[PDB]
From a paper:
Ubiquitin is an important signaling molecule involved in a myriad of signaling pathways through the binding of a diverse set of receptors. Structurally, ubiquitin consists of one five-stranded β-sheet and one short (1.5 turn) and one long (3.5 turn) α-helix. Moreover, a single dominant collective motion in ubiquitin was revealed that covers the motion observed in unbound ubiquitin as well as the motion observed in the ensemble of ubiquitin complexes (X-ray structures). This motion, termed the pincer mode, describes the transition between an open and a closed ubiquitin substate.
The conformational preference of binding partners for either the open or the closed ubiquitin substate opens the possibility for a novel computational design strategy: rather than optimizing the binding interface, the conformational preference of ubiquitin is shifted to achieve selective binding. To test the hypothesis that the identified mutants indeed affect binding selectivity by favoring a specific substate along the pincer mode, the change in binding free energy was calculated for six complexes. Assuming that the pincer mode is indeed the factor determining binding specificity, we would expect that the binding affinity would decrease if the preferred substate of ubiquitin in the complex and the conformational preference of the mutant were not compatible. Destabilization by depopulation of the binding-compatible conformation, on the other hand, can fully abrogate binding, and is only limited by the preference of this substate in the complex or the binding free energy. Strikingly, as can be seen in Figure 4, most of the mutations that prefer a pincer mode conformation that is incompatible with the complex formation indeed destabilize the complex substantially. NMR-based titrations are well suited to determine affinities for protein–protein interactions. Here, 15N chemical shifts for ubiquitin and ubiquitin mutants were monitored as a function of increasing dsk2 concentration. When we compared the change in affinity between the studied ubiquitin mutants and wild-type ubiquitin with dsk2, an agreement was found, demonstrating the direct validation of the novel computational method employed here by solution experiments. Using ubiquitin as a case study, the computational protocol was complemented by experimental validation and was shown to yield selective binding by means of a conformational shift due to designed single-residue mutations.
Numbering used by the authors:
A (entry chain B): 327 to 369
B (entry chain A): 1 to 72
The structure:
């Protein structure tokens, strides 16, 4: 499940001020777990 | 005042800064401590990518706030 799989990255994103759970999970799925790669999409 | 800068690998950098310090200045401090060139640095706070010409006070960054550093 992506919510368990990305628990750490989701916490990082929340700490950074990105709180949209479905948007974050989708971005992390498309970047293969990379916060670095997800960030352009989230901004 | 002190602020913190956290990397994605979990390294926390402590910086000495002033409220009227620019983001450009903060990236330079980061370079001095950690060796990261400023052009590679993306600083994130409260869902925003911080812009070089703005100050810490412009973003209401105060004592012991934590910024996140993401490399380009």
């Amino acid at each position: 499940s992506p919510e368990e799989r990305y628990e750490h990255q989701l916490r990082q994103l929340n700490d950074m001020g990105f709180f949209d759970f479905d948007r974050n999970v989708a971005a992390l799925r498309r970047s293969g777990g990379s916060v670095q790669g997800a960030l352009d999409s989230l901004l | 005042m002190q602020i913190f800068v956290k990397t994605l690998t979990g390294k926390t950098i402590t910086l000495e800064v002033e409220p009227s310090d620019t983001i450009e200045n903060v990236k330079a401090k980061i370079q001095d401590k950690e060796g990261i060139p400023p052009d590679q640095q993306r600083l994130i706070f409260a869902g925003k990518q911080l812009e070089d010409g703005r100050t810490l006070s412009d973003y209401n960054i105060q004592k012991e706030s934590t910024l996140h550093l993401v490399l380009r």
